Structure formats: structure tokens, C-alpha cells
């Protein structure tokens, strides 16, 4: 397979520290997308085929390092796009770099919304594509239907914002929140929060888990040892771990708990089966795929389609062309919306003994993403639309 | 694409934790074993009786679970009939596997530093014995470290490696006239370290030596919580770790390990063509962020030593390969190694101080390769015993 020239893109993920358990597989999956596109002949611009090359930088689970590496990739390496980030902390540190330098970050991870950067595109779930339908499911259909919610997360803007939205949503459903605690990212001192869960949920109930990174390992092992188990009526709905982190922790610790995602490895379609089989072929029979990976995979194809539509790598024109791009993704059909996010089907999953999701609920159509939250009173009635100059980042409906 | 021509193939077993608490440590061993295989295959494969065999593999997940290591071993021996399994990390996993490889007269190649007190006819070992790791580390921490002369506190995982390691360390410290002022174990995978931290501060009021035999990802909680607790090199507390190296250091974060210590036969900072080639090849195959380390160098060496033994034996039959492997020499990334009559390898010893980048600064190195003692010469029940499988009158455990 021959190319006429090459283009270099940036990859920026935590390959070290507390977030490497989550972000490492994103680089594996981004490289799989790149290798696929290259094997099909690369990216066509103005009658030439460009091979996609990459520069991988280690964000090291450190938000200033994410900003510093973004500066390098934009100003030194002159990439037309960076594929990166996980924590909303890492994205918030990056956002002023990509805005001030009018560059382009593609960000794949489920998050709190309340954001619509001109210089960021998003393949992760907004709350109405994850926590909102999850909250309804846990409240109405889970084995802990009608029981109170206890909220536990990492101490930064994603879990705090997610839990603000969940508290407003649970008020609107007529449910109850009986606890809300944060641990520093990476911190494994979970014993005090376990004692509070047992006192606040004496008959069991719903635990909403927004812990990010490897502190999930201690969380799931210690709740089980304390008898906070599905057998005793305790069910954890997690937003920031899926099949990769389930398989690292050990599925014995996750069986009977729940997730809410747009992609799940258990989706039984030719597209989903091909994604899983190609990942295993590239990286080993043991390796899983999952929503974070599928989100990251899609960013590379959406970028490639926007480049070919725009007829250029210029991020100014590609960011304009990207709105309205469609893709037959492993999850099903996605479309980039005026707010820079994607429409996605929503799945609720019950974790099985093998660490896969059994899909217990699925939306009937792709849900259109709301970045400005319609439950949080300070964002309700606002929206984002970058296809209309009179609307933009944040306008009143 | 490849123009290399093979007559046939041989399928080997790879058996490591790709899931659960040991995956932080074992995952890179599969990466390294596969690099050695691809290197040998690119150079023409394994030559037996006029035929060139491509090495194929079957990877099984031990899942950080000792019964699973035993069951996957039974499958690889009895159903797959592999001529060799490269596998194991925890001495608990090895002990579960040992009766399977012995009973079935098969061949396990085991790469990880351990407690010795073992000499299976069905196992070869590329990891340090205590005289190639904990013994020289103990002397260094007691005599030359910034905590020279200060008491020792022992913390490890609750299984046969840390408990046996610490038995040897207690005997050695007594022989040097030092003090051990604590000894605590956590179940493997358990992150509840705060109680042990409180005992360290009470037992070592102005710092001292901590010997860390924790295995697997419980190391992450340990190093993060000790720093918050003021158990730091700046406060006179120095950890010497036997079961983590550059891979785990990079995953935990070097800010948590800087100024602590390791004892290993290979370190990525070794400044030789062989050491630099190993590191550069691993980054070329798996990414520029990827490190090499002793567990990986040990694993790499197993595949080359197996290949050399097959070519020496003139057959894949593990009985004859295990007989031929004694006496084999390899130019390894760490320097020259030789398989000894006790199925272990002679290795240079390095003591390293962890730098801000998570690399080792080598602060002591042996003048010669150290001959491995599997039967420990400080532990009273093993003192005066040795192993020699090359001489029929001696074998697994005989009086010197
Ligand atoms: Ca060019
Ligand atoms: Ca890593
Ligand atoms: Ca620009
Ligand atoms: Ca109610
Ligand atoms: Ca997605
Ligand atoms: Ca053009
Ligand atoms: Ca919106
Ligand atoms: Ca794994
Ligand atoms: Ca045999
Ligand atoms: Ca070794
Ligand atoms: Ca012959
Ligand atoms: Ca011996
Ligand atoms: Cl010598």
C-alpha cells in the first residue's frame, strides 16, 4: 500500500499514574483506527493520499502535564488535531491552550457537560446520554427501585458536577440522596465511606460511583469485604469504568453491579463483533473493548471524514466540516451535532460473572446530546450551537 | 510480511496474570516473551535435525489466582502438550504449579526473583535467589544507606515469598547485630495499609529501613499512603523493594518512589550496548513510553535459554532439553549468565537508588556474577544444603 505523503496527529493520554489503568487502552485503540485507515490507503486531500503518523505524549495523570504536552503538540509538532484526555480536570487544563492557540482537541470520555468549546469535539456521553437514564433505571427498574442513593466520587469537577445533576434529578423523581463523599484522585482510604454507606443504607440501595482511575480497585474489593454486595441489596452504578477496568479489578468484585454506556462489548452486531475481534487480533485474545475505547476509535474516523469533506487538514475548516458528519460506529450510527458532541444510543448493563455487560435496557433511537444540563438550575434553558454565529457556546432557548 | 522460510512450527505456553492484582507486574512479561519469540523467528526460528521451526505460543491468563495457574498448567501440559511453559510470578502461583509439572514430568520456566528453598527437576529459574538480591540489599541498607545502623521494619504480602524472604532477612540482620522492630503482612491485593503505617512511625520514630516484599498493585496504595504519612526519604525513611522495578515504579508514579531502593540483576540504567539494545527494541515494538526491568529481562532470557537448550539437545523433548539446559551461557541484557546445576543462573548484583524519572542509579555492583544459592545459607533449616541436578549422587537437596 503506497502513500503520496504523511500527516502527523497528536495522541495525549495517561500511560503512567492513577489514570493509566483507564487511558492506556485508548492509545491502543487510537492506533488501531490509524492502522486501519492507513491499510485502506490513508487520508485523501486534494488528489493525494496521506499516511497518518502520530506522536504519543504521556499526560502522566497530571493536569499541568496535559497542558504542557498540548502546547508541545500544537506549537512544536504542528499537529492538525490531538486525540486526548480522560479526567474533566485534564480537559479543563487543556481547554485554554486549544482555545488561545485556536487548535483542536478530540476528547473521548463520558463527562458532566456544562461545556461547549469551539476548539473541542466530544465522543463521550453527556449526562442525558449516561447518568440521567441510569438514575431513572436504578430508581424505577433495578432491584433497588425506590431505595435511597449514596453518591461517592473522585474530588474534582466531573464527579462533583455529575452528583449536582443527580441530586436535582433524584428530587424531580421524588427519590432520596442519603450521602455524598469525595476522595482525592488515587486515594485508597475508602473505609470511612464504607461505614457511612452501611449506616445510611441499612436495607441496601443505590451507590452512584464516579471514582476515576485505579482507586476503583480498592473501592470494589473493600465494599465486597464489608458485605456491601448485591446479595445484601447494594447495587453500584459506575460511570467512569467499563470492561477494561472490570477485567483488571477482577469480575468477582463487579458481578451484579451496573454501568451506563453507549457502547458495550456484548452488543451483538457485525460492527460490534468486528471491533472486538480486530482489537484481540492486534493486542491478544485476553483484550477487551469498551465505551471509552469505542469513543476514542470513533474520534479518528470522524476526523478523517471531516478532513476528506473539508478537502484540507486545516483545523479551522475541519472543525466547521465536522458538524453533520455521520459514521457507522461499533455502537451503531453516530452523528456530530452543532454542539460538537455526538448522538448515541444509550445502554444500561448488569455486569456478569465474566466481566461483560448484560444489556437490560437500550434507547429506541440515538439520544441527541445536551451539554448544558436540563436538570441543574444554573444551566437549564441554555444550549450550544456552533453552526449559527448568533447562538454559539451558551445561548438561552 | 516476511520472506523467512520455516519447515514447521513448535507451540510453547505462556502463563501470566493479565487480569487481577498481579497484572500490574506480569502483563509486561508476556510483551517481553513475545519480543524474544519474534526476534528468534525473524532470525530463522529454532533448528532441529535439519528443520527450521517457527515458535508459536498459547497465552493463558493465570488471573492472579493460584488454582487457575494449576488448571491452565494442566491444560497446556495434557491437552496442548507444549514442550515448555514460560510463566508464573508469585511463589504462591509457582507452588500451585510445581506438583503439576513434576507429576506430568513437564517443564516450567519461571523468571521472578524469589525466596529459593526449592530445586524442582521440572523448573528452571532466571530470577534472583536471596544471595543474588535480599542478602546484598540487607548489607547495603544496614552498612551504606542513609539509614545505616537504624532498625529494620518488614512489610509484605501474606504468602510463602515474603514470609520466607523475611525469615532470611531476620537471620541476616541478627548476624550483623542489627534490630528488626516490626514484621506485618497484608493479604495479596489488600489496600488497608494505615494500621501498618501507624506501627512504622511508632517503631521507627526518626526513620530507618523498610523492607518491602509487597507483590502486585497493593504497592500503589502503600507508596501513596506512606508519603502522606511522612514516611519519606526526607524524614529518614528508606524502602528497599524486592518485587517491584521500573514497570511498577512508572505505573505508581516516580514522585512516590524517588529516593527509595531496589536490588536486581538487570536495571534499565545499565550502560552497555546489550542493555541499550534491549530497551530500544522494547520501545520500538510497544511504544516510546515503555520501560524494561529485571522481571522482563529474566523472562526474555528464559526464551533464549530454552532455544539454546533445544538446539544443544537436538530435540524439543523437555526431558532432554532440561538435561541440556545446565551449563548454557547467554549474552543477556544484564551481562553474561550461565545456567547452573541447581537450574538457576549466575547473575551480577546491582543495588539501585530510584531517581526522579523512576530509573535506578546503580550505587553498588558485584565485581563478578554471583552463583545462586537456592538452599539459603542464613536460614538454619537450609544451611549446609545445596542442589545439583548434573550429578546423580546429589540432586534436589543434599548435605555439602
Ligand atoms: Ca509533506
Ligand atoms: Ca504504562
Ligand atoms: Ca487553527
Ligand atoms: Ca418517593
Ligand atoms: Ca461514546
Ligand atoms: Ca483543499
Ligand atoms: Ca446543548
Ligand atoms: Ca489486562
Ligand atoms: Ca516430559
Ligand atoms: Ca534475572
Ligand atoms: Ca540429531
Ligand atoms: Ca543451592
Ligand atoms: Cl567468577
Per DSSP, the residues of A104-137 read -EEE-S--------TTEEE-SPPGGGTHHHHHHH
Nearest to A16 among B21, B190, B250 (CB): B250
- Cell output for B91: 511463589
Nearest to B19 among A16, A189, A248 (CB): A248
Q: In what order do the strands lie in the sheet with A332-336?
A: A326-329, A332-336, A342-343
Strand pairing of B85-87 and B8-16?
parallel
- Cell output for B211: 523492607
- Chain B residues with CB inside 8 Å of A285's CB? 59
On the 0-12 / 13-18 / 19+ scale of CB atoms within 10 A, B206 is exposed
Alpha-carbon span A92 to A107, nearest angstrom: 11
What does R_g of chain A's alpha carbons equal in angstroms?
20
Alpha-carbon span A85 to A351, nearest angstrom: 26
Alpha-carbon span A196 to A155, nearest angstrom: 17
* Greatest alpha-carbon span in chain A: 67
On the 0-12 / 13-18 / 19+ scale of CB atoms within 10 A, A79 is buried
Alpha-carbon span A181 to A185, nearest angstrom: 13
- C-alpha distance from residue B273 to each of B64, B99, B333 (Å): 35, 40, 8
Binding residues of B for Ca(2+): 8, 18, 49, 105, 126, 177, 294, 298, 314, 318-319
- C-alpha distance from residue B177 to each of A132, B170, B210, B378 (Å): 65, 10, 17, 14
Residue B336 β-bridge partners: B331
- Per the CB < 8 A criterion, the answer to whether A260 and A206 are in contact is no
Nearest to A109 by CA among A84, A146, A144, A81: A84
- A35 annotated as ligand-binding: no
Q: Which CATH architecture does the domain made up of B131-264 adopt?
A: 3-Layer(aba) Sandwich (3.40)
Q: Which ligand is nearest to the CA of A383?
A: 7
Dihedral of alpha carbons B353, B354, B355, B361, sign:
positive
Residue B253 φ/ψ region, left for φ over 0, alpha for ψ in the -120 to 50 degree band, beta for the rest: left
The alpha carbon of residue B220 is apart from the nearest alpha carbon of chain A, in Å, by 9
* Greatest alpha-carbon span in chain B: 68
A364 CB neighbour count, 10 Å cutoff: 7
Name the DSSP letter for residue A345: -
Establish how many alpha carbons lie within 13 A of residue A187's alpha carbon, considering only the half-sphere containing its beta carbon.
18
Strand pairing of B329-332 and B335-339?
antiparallel
What angle do helix axes B273-286 and B23-42 make, rounded to 10 degrees? 100
- Chain B residues with CB inside 8 Å of A284's CB? 18, 30, 59
The data reach a resolution, in angstroms, of 2.0
Nearest to B220 among A15, A191, A214 (CB): A214
- C-alpha distance from residue A356 to each of A245, A281, A350, B342 (Å): 11, 19, 8, 45
- Per the CB < 8 A criterion, the answer to whether A48 and A5 are in contact is yes
- Per the CB < 8 A criterion, the answer to whether A343 and A367 are in contact is yes
- Cell output for A98: 486549544
- What 3-state class would DSSP assign to B376? coil
B361 CB neighbour count, 10 Å cutoff: 12
The alpha carbon of residue B223 is apart from the nearest alpha carbon of chain A, in Å, by 11
Q: In what order do the strands lie in the sheet with A234-238?
A: A177-183, A149-154, A205-210, A234-238, A258-261, A347-351, A357-362
Experimental technique for the deposited model: X-ray
Contacts 24+ apart (CB under 8 A), B320-323: B321/B83, B321/B84, B321/B107, B322/B107, B322/B121, B322/B122, B322/B124
Output the CA angle B38-B39-B40, nearest 5 degrees: 95
Length of chain B equals: 400
- Cell output for B64: 492472579
Q: Which CATH architecture does the domain made up of A128-261 adopt?
A: 3-Layer(aba) Sandwich (3.40)
- Per the CB < 8 A criterion, the answer to whether A45 and A312 are in contact is yes
Alpha-carbon span B202 to A2, nearest angstrom: 68
Establish how many alpha carbons lie within 13 A of residue B147's alpha carbon, considering only the half-sphere containing its beta carbon.
29
Residue B146 φ/ψ region, left for φ over 0, alpha for ψ in the -120 to 50 degree band, beta for the rest: alpha
- Cell output for A168: 436535582
Name the DSSP letter for residue A355: S
- Per the CB < 8 A criterion, the answer to whether B132 and B265 are in contact is yes
What does R_g of chain B's alpha carbons equal in angstroms?
21
- What 3-state class would DSSP assign to B277? helix
Alpha-carbon span B242 to B133, nearest angstrom: 7
Length of chain A equals: 397
| Residue matched to cell numbers 441496601 | A204
Alpha-carbon span A220 to B161, nearest angstrom: 26
Alpha-carbon span B312 to B192, nearest angstrom: 50
| Residue matched to cell numbers 458485605 | A227
Buried b (16+ CB within 10 A) or exposed e, A325-352: bebebbbbebbbbebbbbbbbbbbbbbe
- Per the CB < 8 A criterion, the answer to whether A53 and A8 are in contact is yes
Alpha-carbon span A331 to A291, nearest angstrom: 8
Alpha-carbon span B110 to B302, nearest angstrom: 8
Dihedral of alpha carbons B368, B372, B377, B378, sign:
positive
- Chain B residues with CB inside 8 Å of A214's CB? 217, 220
The alpha carbon of residue B228 is apart from the nearest alpha carbon of chain A, in Å, by 10
Output the CA angle A309-A311-A312, nearest 5 degrees: 120
- Cell output for B136: 546484598
- Cell output for B96: 500451585
- Cell output for A347: 445502554
Chain centroid offset of residue A148 CA: 26
- Chain B residues with CB inside 8 Å of A17's CB? 251-253
A199 CB neighbour count, 10 Å cutoff: 10
* Chain B: residues touching A (Cβ < 8 Å): 18-21, 23, 30, 59, 61, 63-64, 189-194, 217, 220-221, 224-225, 250-253, 287-289
Nearest to B176 by CA among B222, B204, B135: B135
Name the DSSP letter for residue A356: P
Output the CA angle B10-B15-B16, nearest 5 degrees: 140
- What 3-state class would DSSP assign to A48? strand
- Cell output for B55: 515458535
- Per the CB < 8 A criterion, the answer to whether B97 and B26 are in contact is no
- What 3-state class would DSSP assign to B4? coil
CB contact under 8 A, A248 and B224: no
- Chain A residues with CB inside 8 Å of B287's CB? 15, 27, 56
- Per the CB < 8 A criterion, the answer to whether B389 and B395 are in contact is yes
Residues 6+ apart with CB under 8 A from A146: A139, A175
Chain centroid offset of residue B100 CA: 21
Amino acid at each position: 500500500v503506497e502513500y503520496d505523503d504523511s500527516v502527523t496527529v497528536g495522541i495525549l493520554h495517561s500511560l503512567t499514574g492513577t489514570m493509566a489503568i483507564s487511558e492506556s487502552t485508548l492509545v491502543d485503540t487510537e492506533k488501531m483506527a490509524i492502522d486501519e485507515i492507513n491499510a485502506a490507503g490513508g487520508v485523501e486531500v486534494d488528489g493525494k493520499k496521506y499516511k497518518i503518523e502520530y506522536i504519543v505524549e504521556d499526560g502522566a495523570s497530571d493536569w499541568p502535564t496535559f497542558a504542557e504536552k498540548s502546547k508541545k503538540l500544537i506549537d512544536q509538532d504542528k499537529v492538525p488535531v490531538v486525540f486526548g484526555g480522560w479526567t474533566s480536570a485534564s480537559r479543563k487544563a487543556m481547554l485554554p491552550v486549544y482555545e488561545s492557540k485556536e487548535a483542536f482537541l478530540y476528547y473521548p470520555i463520558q463527562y458532566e457537560g456544562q461545556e461547549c468549546s469551539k476548539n473541542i469535539f466530544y465522543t463521550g456521553a453527556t449526562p442525558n446520554q449516561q447518568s440521567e437514564p441510569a438514575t431513572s433505571y436504578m430508581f424505577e427498574k433495578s432491584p433497588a427501585a425506590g431505595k435511597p442513593f449514596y453518591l461517592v466520587g473522585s474530588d474534582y469537577v466531573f464527579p462533583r458536577t455529575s452528583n449536582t445533576i443527580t441530586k436535582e434529578q433524584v428530587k424531580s423523581l421524588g427519590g432520596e440522596v442519603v450521602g455524598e463523599d469525595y476522595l482525592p484522585l488515587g486515594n485508597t482510604e475508602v473505609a470511612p465511606i464504607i461505614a457511612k454507606i452501611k449506616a445510611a443504607l441499612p436495607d441496601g440501595g443505590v451507590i452512584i460511583n464516579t471514582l476515576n482511575g485505579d482507586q476503583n480497585v480498592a473501592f470494589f474489593k473493600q465494599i465486597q469485604d464489608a458485605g456491601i454486595t448485591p446479595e445484601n441489596g447494594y447495587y453500584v452504578m459506575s460511570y467512569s469504568i467499563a470492561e477494561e477496568e472490570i477485567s483488571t479489578i477482577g469480575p468477582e468484585f463487579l458481578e451484579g453491579h451496573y454501568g451506563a454506556w453507549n457502547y458495550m462489548m456484548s452488543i451483538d452486531t457485525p460492527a460490534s463483533k468486528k471491533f472486538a475481534a480486530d482489537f484481540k487480533a492486534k493486542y491478544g485474545d485476553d483484550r477487551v473493548v469498551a465505551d471509552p475505547q469505542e469513543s476514542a476509535y470513533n474520534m479518528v474516523y470522524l476526523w478523517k471524514k471531516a478532513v476528506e469533506k473539508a478537502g484540507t487538514f486545516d483545523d479551522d475548516k475541519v472543525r466547521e466540516a465536522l458538524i453533520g458528519i455521520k459514521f457507522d460506529a461499533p455502537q451503531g450510527p453516530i452523528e456530530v451535532r452543532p454542539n460538537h458532541h455526538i448522538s448515541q444510543i444509550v445502554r444500561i448493563g448488569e455486569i456478569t460473572s465474566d466481566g461483560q455487560f448484560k444489556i437490560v435496557e437500550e434507547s429506541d433511537y440515538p439520544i441527541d446530546p445536551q451539554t448544558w444540563n436540563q436538570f441543574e438550575p444554573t444551566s437549564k434553558g441554555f444550549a450550544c450551537d456552533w453552526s449559527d454565529p448568533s447562538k454559539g457556546e451558551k445561548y438561552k432557548l
